From a paper:
Aminopeptidase N (APN, CD13) belongs to the M1 family of zinc metallopeptidases, also termed gluzincins, which comprises enzymes of medical interest for infectious and autoimmune diseases, cancer and hypertension. Mammalian APN are type II membrane-bound ectoenzymes that dimerize on the cell surface. We determined several crystal structures of dimeric human and porcine APN (hAPN and pAPN) ectodomains, which reveal the dynamic conformation of this protein. Each crystal captured a single APN conformation, with all the monomers in the same form. These structures identified three distinct APN conformations, based on active site accessibility, which we termed closed, intermediate and open forms.
The human and pig APN ectodomains share 79% residue identity, domain architecture and dimerization. As the N-terminal and middle portions of the hAPN and pAPN ectodomains are heavily glycosylated, we produced them in CHO cells. The hAPN structure adopts an intermediate conformation in the crystals; the distance between the N terminus of each monomer in the dimer is 116 Å, and the angle difference of domain II with the closed conformation is ~6°. The phenylalanine adopted a distinct conformation in the intermediate and open APN conformations. Domain II movement was accompanied by a conformational change of the α26-α27 loop in domain IV, which became more solvent-exposed; the phenylalanine side chain faced into domain IV in the intermediate and open conformations and the peptide plug was removed from the active site. The small interdomain movement of the intermediate APN structure would be sufficient for peptide processing. The extent of APN movement nonetheless appears to be sufficient for release of the hydrolyzed peptide N-terminal residue, which is not plugged by domain IV in the open or in the intermediate APN conformations. The TGEV (transmissible gastroenteritis coronavirus) spike does not bind hAPN because it lacks the N-linked glycan recognized by porcine CoV in pAPN1516. The soluble S proteins specifically inhibited pAPN-mediated catalysis, measured as the hydrolysis of the L-pNA substrate, and had no effect on hAPN activity.
Numbering used by the authors: 63 to 891, 894 to 967
Write the structure that this text describes.
């Protein structure tokens, strides 16, 4: 499986002998099939490169490209500035390393430039890689758009190139396309699209030269899309593309309104202007990758770019602002200054995942979006990073070579832990000094490439220049958070005022085998409060220490990690927990809203880790009966979802629902009178989210008044279908519960609304809600639909199946389905997420019978692998073993607790 490593063309990393300067690329997509039923694109290119060290071979990336021979060879070599290229000996293609290899009869000379001409063609496949095709239905008409996805190593699939991020170059892009179609790229066209002289049916669009940039950020799109535009004061043209009908109705308007302000924010937050003449953002009906930050032409999944104020919810709105903010952040951080190699992906994706909140907050200052990062990124990644199977943020460059190894880095660790760690960094340094660090870093390395130590250097300079006191260097502090996996749990003893830290692990029976330089002790910044008042900062530099900041006497209490800015969990002594609970009972508002969620989330997590009694966590939810903020409720609901997954098929679920029924009812009554009987929605975003959770928790836990009103609204809709009386914020929870309470009539109505849907946001809500039927035959019939591309789009297959197994009645149904035709499923679905299916179907597993079924599932499907889901299967087995143990230990205690507190 390994080729001769002594040969440069058998090594995954490019050699350092040749460095490109300028490319010219002409592409011509054919949007109709040929004789072999293949969509093909024709291409021609020229790469001008500099010989940095004398070499007798040209090694360049090439993937699935078929070359037209010219002058006897795959390629033609020319000189520039009087250089004399050697004759070509022969060319070959090396598939594993994805190289075009041009062997020369002599050596290129050092410092001299050369040009290589190539003429080729490739498949315009339905594969979402390189230059590919995307198909959607515009009514009964089948539309085809040629578009691109280069990240991380697929630029080489559209034209031959030195396809590594630090091989920056300039690109002259020309698109040959049908007459009535718009061509788009990174830069603006040099002029109006002109007819191809050989065939007026085609047009030629030549784009201006790009600045120095990485191949993975290139973009070519040919479509019949329309646009809304808006020109900013500083000259930057802002355009937004989508299907003509979607833009005609104004669904691109909101994205347009926020793009300007977001670009303005980043211009100031970075202290460098927007480096491009324009900003294109395009919404594609099909785009599994979510969004790609191509420089000047950012591609989005349609349902994340388009917005309809008459049917899209606030979450839909929040989705748009935050995603746009993320990708636009890359237009400086990532595109202007690019990573040296893929092992530093966490710095790029982590930074954008963090500042997406800052940008979006600028566009919508009334929302307080920044507060949501703790739930969305911090606690999300903490579930995965608290496992023995996690990995450090940073990876040695030499360990990331193959395309598969690169793809594995695009995970929750890189994004969410990357964001969390950087937010913590911007916290213990002043944000102002963090900004100052950013500014110099950007200016210094513009149009170039960096490793993460470069950013550390510039931040360190800002620290010295601003005279910010730290326990040690920025480098040494951050090493604790990048070189080793996981995060600490800080246990506080408020009697002695001593702090203690250790590697936090969700599984009490975990087996960490990955060694660490520091042996899992961190240098950690501690912000804290006492009786609502914030104290002086502290630095924990050892396993254990003492300070009077964490000592208490009498009725006073303390709390660590203000607003959860630090990437760690906190535990307290029994005495301190009691005072905090008493504070929550007396006046919970005295504790920051984020920290109220912390108290709950940490407690439930520490409970699973055998660090607090499970009854403690449950006690930390008692105050929720008078809690009206969204965040603390959401945190408890998220943690109790595990309890639901463990107990919703047992005797425990009864008292559990009765408890949640007791806690949420006053909140439900409140919103009922607050919104004046659901006539209005709150003006504050959090309150809007809070109301939705209240209604959602009320109905699923059996409060009568909620059940009556959701089915009442839905029947009212069934009578006025073209006049949906249900506010968008409430649609998912109302559709679902009404479908659950009703039967065939409701389901068929919802199904027809889904089939006729012209708004993707609405169709997504219907798809999920349809899985809420309590009729087994209906769910069974729905299951058969999920594999039919005419009924359910393949990109929505897994999620629709997943939504079905979320239903208790669908659990055994889907699990039987997975066991029955896995062999047919692994063959006849590509990009079907077996990983998510395996995880979703095994979440409920808590018995020895389920484990043995899963153990047999693995054995029965040995010779036919599990592919991308192979890893999820091993984690499901370990999780199942953990669940069996947890259930047998907490079943009695939890049943008793829910019973006592349901009265
Ligand atoms: C991708 O696209 C870029 C941008 O268009 C191309 O770069 C251009 O390439 C042109 C063709 O070689 C260049 O034209 C030449 O410019 C020479 C002057 O060079 C200076 O360039 C700097 C900027 O780098 C300016 O500040 C100076 O003011 C000058 O413009 C001329 O001397 C040269 O002379 C011509 O030679 C031709 C040869 O046939 C004669 O026919 C003609 O009569 C005339 O004597 C010529 O005009 C151009 O400078 C250059 N533009 C820039 C800004 O770099 C890349 O070549 C493209 N890449 C690929 C691989 O195709
Ligand atoms: C650049 O060159 C590469 C390498 O040659 C091309 O890749 C090749 O693509 C073809 C599809 O056109 C693959 O062919 C196979 O097709 C069968 C199914 O179709 C079959 O058609 C033949 C007649 O040609 C019949 O005799 C058979 O009964 C059958 O109907 C399918 O079973 C295979 O899975 C495969 O798709 C071929 O495998 C593939 N070659 C390699 C080695 O990758 C590529 O198309 C070309 N690019 C362009 C732009 O044409
Ligand atoms: C969170 O921590 C625990 C969670 O359970 C709570 O402790 C509970 O506090 C109440 C306070 O009223 C205790 O009630 C007491 O119970 C005794 C009798 O003991 C009982 O005996 C029967 C058998 O006869 C057992 O089945 C019970 O388990 C219990 O041992 C009775 O005289 C009074 O009702 C007395 O108040 C309750 O026992 C206790 N739960 C436990 C430990 O089982 C705690 O309050 C809560 N903290 C909060 C509210 O924030
Ligand atoms: C995208 O941004 C545009 C531009 O701001 C928004 O359009 C504008 O929306 C406002 C608020 O509804 C409208 O204000 C109105 O002004 C009139 C006076 O002209 C006043 O009588 C009304 O009471 C109201 O306040 C304004 O007409 C409108 N401007 C344009 C260009 O039509 C739009 O709302 C934004 N779109 C989205 C979905 O965010
Ligand atoms: C492709 O080229 C043709 C010919 O230049 C363009 O057709 C012109 O389009 C403009 C704007 O719509 C019309 O006002 C002219 O009458 C057309 N010129 C003719 C008839 O020769 C066409 O616009 C180009 N396609 C694109 C991408 O717009
Ligand atoms: C902790 O986070 C809270 C938000 O959960 C912050 O409270 C906001 O602070 C900003 C400062 O500009 C005010 O404009 C907002 O009105 C506050 N929101 C609310 C609803 O209180 C708070 O600043 C943070 N505390 C610290 C010091 O870290
Ligand atoms: C940086 O700090 C130094 C003093 O430490 C001083 O020159 C001035 O305050 C700042 N200006 C720069 C960038 O030198
Ligand atoms: C969907 O739209 C078509 C075209 O108007 C119509 O015939 C059909 O009844 C619609 N389906 C329903 C029942 O919503
Ligand atoms: Zn990103």
């Amino acid at each position: 499986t390994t080729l001769d490593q002594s040969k440069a063309w058998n090594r995954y990393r490019l050699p350092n002998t040749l460095k490109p300067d300028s490319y010219r690329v002409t592409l011509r997509p054919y949007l109709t099939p040929n004789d072999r039923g293949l969509y093909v694109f024709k291409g021609s290119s020229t790469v001008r490169f500099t010989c940095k060290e004398a070499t007798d071979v040209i090694i360049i990336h090439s993937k699935k490209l078929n070359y037209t021979l010219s002058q006897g060879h795959r390629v033609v070599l020319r000189g520039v500035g009087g250089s004399q290229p050697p004759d070509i000996d022969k060319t070959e293609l090396v598939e594993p390393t994805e190289y075009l290899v041009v062997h020369l009869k002599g050596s290129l000379v050092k410092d001299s430039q050369y040009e290589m001409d190539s003429e080729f063609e490739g498949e315009l496949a339905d594969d979402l890689a390189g230059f590919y095709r995307s198909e959607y239905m515009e009514g009964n008409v089948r539309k085809v758009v040629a578009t691109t996805q280069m990240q991380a190593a697929d630029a080489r699939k559209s034209f031959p190139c030195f396809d590594e991020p630090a091989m920056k170059a300039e690109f002259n892009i020309t698109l040959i396309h049908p007459k009535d179609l718009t061509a788009l790229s990174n830069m603006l066209p040099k002029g109006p699209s002109t007819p191809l002289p050989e065939d007026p049916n085609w047009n030629v669009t030549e784009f201006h030269t790009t600045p120095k940039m990485s191949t993975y950020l290139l973009a070519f799109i040919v479509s019949e899309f329309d646009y809304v535009e808006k020109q900013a004061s500083n000259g930057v043209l802002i355009r937004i593309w989508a299907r003509p009908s979607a833009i005609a109705a104004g669904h691109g308007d909101y994205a347009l309104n926020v793009t300007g302000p977001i670009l303005n924010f980043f211009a100031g937050h970075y202290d460098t202007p927007y480096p491009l003449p324009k900003s294109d953002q395009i919404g594609l009906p099909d785009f599994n990758a979510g969004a790609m930050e191509n420089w000047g032409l950012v591609t989005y999944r349609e349902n994340s770019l388009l917005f309809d104020p008459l049917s899209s919810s606030s979450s839909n709105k929040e989705r748009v602002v935050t995603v746009i903010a993320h990708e636009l952040a890359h237009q400086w951080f990532g595109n202007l200054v690019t990573i040296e190699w893929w092992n530093d992906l966490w710095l790029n994706e982590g930074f954008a995942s963090y500042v997406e909140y800052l940008g979006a907050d600028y566009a919508e200052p009334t929302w307080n979006l920044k507060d949501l990062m703790v739930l969305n990124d911090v606690y999300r990644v903490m579930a995965v990073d608290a496992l023995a199977s996690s990995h450090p943020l940073s990876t040695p460059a030499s360990e990331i070579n193959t395309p598969a190894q690169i793809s594995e880095l695009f995970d929750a660790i890189s994004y969410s832990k990357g964001a969390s760690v950087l937010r913590m960094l911007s916290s213990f340094l002043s944000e102002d000094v963090f900004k100052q660090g950013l500014a110099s870093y950007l200016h210094t390395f513009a149009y170039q490439n960096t490793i993460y130590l470069n950013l550390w250097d510039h931040l360190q300079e800002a620290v010295n220049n601003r005279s910010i006191q730290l326990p040690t260097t920025v480098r040494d502090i951050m090493n604790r958070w990048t070189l080793q996996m996981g995060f600490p749990v800080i246990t506080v003893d408020t009697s002695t005022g001593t702090l203690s830290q250790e590697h936090f692990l969700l599984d009490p029976d975990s087996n960490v085998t990955r060694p660490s330089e520091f042996n899992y002790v961190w240098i950690v910044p501690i912000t804290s409060i006492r009786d609502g008042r914030q104290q002086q900062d502290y630095w924990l530099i050892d396993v254990r220490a003492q300070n009077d900041l964490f000592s208490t006497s009498g009725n006073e209490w303390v709390l660590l990690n203000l607003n959860v800015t630090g990437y760690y969990r906190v535990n307290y002594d029994e005495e301190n927990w009691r005072k905090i609970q008493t504070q929550l009972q007396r006046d919970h508002s005295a504790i920051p809203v984020i920290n109220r969620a912390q108290i709950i989330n940490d407690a439930f997590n520490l409970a699973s880790a055998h660090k607090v009694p499970v009854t403690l966590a449950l006690n930390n939810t008692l105050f929720l009966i008078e809690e009206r903020q969204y965040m603390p409720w959401e945190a408890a609901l998220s943690s109790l979802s595990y309890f639901k997954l463990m107990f919703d098929r047992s005797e425990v679920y009864g008292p559990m629902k009765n408890y949640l029924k007791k806690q949420v009812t006053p909140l439900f009554i409140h919103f009922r009178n607050n919104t004046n009987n659901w006539r209005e929605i709150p003006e504050n975003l959090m309150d809007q989210y809070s109301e939705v959770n209240a209604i959602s928790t009320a109905c699923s836990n059996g409060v009568p008044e909620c059940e009556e009103m959701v089915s009442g609204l839905f029947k009212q809709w069934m009578e006025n279908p073209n006049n949906n009386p249900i506010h968008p914020n409430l649609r998912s929870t109302v559709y679902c519960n009404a479908i659950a309470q009703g039967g065939e009539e409701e389901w068929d109505f919802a199904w027809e609304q889904f089939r006729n849907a012209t708004l993707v946001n609405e169709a997504d809500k219907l798809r999920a809600a349809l899985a809420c039927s309590k009729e087994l035959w209906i769910l069974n019939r729905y299951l058969s639909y999920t594999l039919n591309p005419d009924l359910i789009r393949k990109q929505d297959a897994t999620s629709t199946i997943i939504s079905i197994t979320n239903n208790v009645i669908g659990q055994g149904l889907v699990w039987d389905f997975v066991q029955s035709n896995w062999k047919k499923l692994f063959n006849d679905y590509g990009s079907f997420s077996f990983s998510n299916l395996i995880q979703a179907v095994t979440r409920r597993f808590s018995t020895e019978y389920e484990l043995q079924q899963l153990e047999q599932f693995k054995k029965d499907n040995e010779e036919t692998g599990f592919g991308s889901g192979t890893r999820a299967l091993e984690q499901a087995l370990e999780k199942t073993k953990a669940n069996i143990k947890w259930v047998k230990e907490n079943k009695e205690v939890v049943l008793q607790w829910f019973t006592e507190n349901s009265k």
